[PDB]
């Protein structure tokens, strides 16, 4: 009934930060339904490639914001604690809400 919202830029660190939590939940607690990949929201910047003027010849980059959702159904105070201080993320951001 309490779910976790995963975001980030590199999906190398984003995926690997869901999978530790899956077994810091499954083994470590009650039932938790597997990682669901919410769609990636893509900011794009297209820009003139040189300093002055060549209006053709752009280069574009993009900032990929990936989402990942894992639902946890029932509280086990080892899940709460393991998922509190055993945090090992890097550029990932996590969220939790009771509702």
């Amino acid at each position: 009934k309490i779910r976790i919202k995963l975001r980030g830029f590199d999906h190398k660190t984003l995926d690997a930060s869901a999978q530790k939590i899956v077994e810091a939940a499954r083994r470590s607690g009650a039932q938790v339904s597997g990682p669901i990949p919410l769609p990636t929201r893509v900011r794009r910047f297209t820009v003139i490639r040189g300093p002055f003027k060549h209006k053709d010849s752009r280069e574009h980059f993009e900032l990929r914001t990936h989402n990942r959702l894992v639902d946890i159904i029932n509280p086990n105070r080892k899940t709460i604690e393991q998922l509190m201080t055993l945090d090992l993320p890097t550029g990932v951001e996590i969220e939790i809400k009771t509702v």
Partner: protein, 127 residues
């Protein structure tokens, strides 16, 4: 109790359900000729039926989404060609020569910087 097939054309995709009957066709909660009324390429989707000899053998209930009316129709045609290839897949024998077993790789080519339409290029000036 039924047979199934999958096809897609240009971001449009089709779910095909085949459960034998009069030949009645249902599309997304609609009669076939109602949804597609007035579109003259419609009957080309069930073209693999006509060549499989099954006329009023099968009814059809079909869900479809994405793309547009006239490219969805090609997505159904592959659906029916992958569903008919389920009931006695000796119907592979003459389906693929007719070309009803291949998916269209053809899609919108993108846009290029410096161009206008991704090939169409701006008028040359010279002066």
């Amino acid at each position: 109790e039924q047979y199934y097939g999958t096809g897609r054309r240009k971001e449009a995709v089709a779910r095909v359900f085949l459960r034998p009957g009069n030949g009645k066709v249902t599309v997304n909660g609609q009669d076939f000729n109602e949804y597609f009324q007035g579109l003259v390429r419609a009957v080309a989707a069930l073209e693999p039926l006509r060549a499989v000899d099954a006329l009023g053998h099968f009814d059809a209930y079909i869900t479809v989404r994405g793309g547009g009316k006239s490219g969805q129709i090609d997505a159904i045609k592959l659906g029916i060609a992958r569903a008919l290839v389920q009931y006695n897949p000796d119907y592979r024998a003459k389906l693929k020569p007719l070309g009803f077993l291949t998916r269209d790789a053809r899609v919108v080519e993108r846009k290029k910087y410096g161009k206008h339409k991704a090939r169409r290029a701006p008028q040359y000036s010279k002066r």
